[PDB]
Amino acid sequence: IGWLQEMCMQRRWPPPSYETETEVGLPHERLFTIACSILNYREMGKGKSKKIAKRLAAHRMWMRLQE
């Protein structure tokens, strides 16, 4: 993610922001879903942890930027 932030800076684009939704899924299946917005675009990922969801969000974010 740090590399993506560096690229954002180098491209002189607006800094990325994250919106974390918690308590996703069943009470016994605590998942997390995090969306990431940057410049004009926004992509969202999810996983078993905030780390996973965040990384996936940023990953998809980059893919969208390069789409």
Domains of the chain, earliest start first: 1-67 (3.30.160.20)
Sign, CA torsion 20/21/25/30: positive
Angle between helices 2-10 and 50-65 (to 10 degrees): 30
Nearest to 58 by CA among 11, 29, 50: 50
CA distance 52 to 30: 13
Task: Take residue 11 and report the two structure tokens written for it.
Answer: 């491209």
Q: Whole-angstrom distance between the N-terminal and C-terminal Cα of the chain?
A: 18
